[PDB]
């Protein structure tokens, strides 16, 4: 997206991971009785040149998770549960209502978050949080020039490496902070299918199929990532899938892990 930090720094960043947009979880900062919160944004790429737009906004405050998803007009998720608007959560200390075609979250301690279920996100903080927050939005200290900084406080080499330091926790094998020219894409609706069994599932570490013996010798993620994108790009084509799986078997054999009869257990005979 195009971003505008609390302190007014305009920058572009096209990472497709889930990022810490604003948080009080800032190493080496005192909190002074401020209520803690975290706003995260999951991005989604499209096109080539690769750009990204926000697809999920998540607000974690007062022991509650409110996420707001693209195209789910009139609805939020309270702790993963789809919910109509308006709604009051966290003991009536947080409220979300629909206004002027956007979801407007407001909290008693002053956090304001809005998302229009498309790709505009706004985060507004009371003056008390000056210098007390961090993430992609910076530290809100009226200085726009020190906002591109690691969690540990030191300047970052590049925008994409800075954004990577601010990824939120959670496995996201297909995401990246920057696309170095030649980068596949895949619609998020086709993702669960291609990641599960019958497709690239065997190359994911828990799914318990014919390749689990090799997972600990040839870490599968890079093959998994390549499977889902090669398959998703090929419209789910079986022969792309089988080739990608056979290349993991080749790497496994070179590591001394034999995998006989695999084709029969994944239908690649």
């Amino acid at each position: 997206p195009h971003y505008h930090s609390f302190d007014g720094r305009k920058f572009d960043f096209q990472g497709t991971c889930n990022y810490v947009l604003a948080t009080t979880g800032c190493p080496g900062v005192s909190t002074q009785g401020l209520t803690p919160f975290t706003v995260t944004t999951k991005n989604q790429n499209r096109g080539n040149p690769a750009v990204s737009y926000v697809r999920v906004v998540t607000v974690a405050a007062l022991g509650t998770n409110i996420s707001i998803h693209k195209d789910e007009i009139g609805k939020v998720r309270v702790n993963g549960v789809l919910t109509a608007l308006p709604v009051s959560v966290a003991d009536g200390r947080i409220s979300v209502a629909q206004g002027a075609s956007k979801a407007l979250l407001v909290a008693d301690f002053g956090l304001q978050v809005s998302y229009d279920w498309n790709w505009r996100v706004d985060v507004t903080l009371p003056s008390s949080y000056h210098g007390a927050v961090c993430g992609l939005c910076g530290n809100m200290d009226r200085n726009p020039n020190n906002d591109q900084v690691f969690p540990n406080g030191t300047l970052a080499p590049s925008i994409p490496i800075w954004g990577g330091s601010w990824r939120a926790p959670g496995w996201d094998p297909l995401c990246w902070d920057e696309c170095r020219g030649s980068c596949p894409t895949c619609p998020e609706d086709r993702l669960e299918q291609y990641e599960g069994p019958g497709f690239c599932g065997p190359l994911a570490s828990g799914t318990g199929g014919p390749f689990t013996t090799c997972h600990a010798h040839v870490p599968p993620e890079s093959f998994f990532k390549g499977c889902v994108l090669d398959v998703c790009m090929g419209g789910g084509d079986h022969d792309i899938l089988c080739k990608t799986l056979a290349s993991y078997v080749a790497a496994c054999q070179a590591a001394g892990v034999v995998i006989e009869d695999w084709r029969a257990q994944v239908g690649c005979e």
């Binding site: 997206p1 195009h2 750009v51 990204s52 926000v54 985060v123 939005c137 809100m140």
Partner: peptide, 10 residues
């Protein structure tokens, strides 16, 4: 005064 971080696109 309150301050605002926003984003849109791309």
């Amino acid at each position: 005064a309150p301050a605002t971080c926003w984003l849109w696109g791309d």
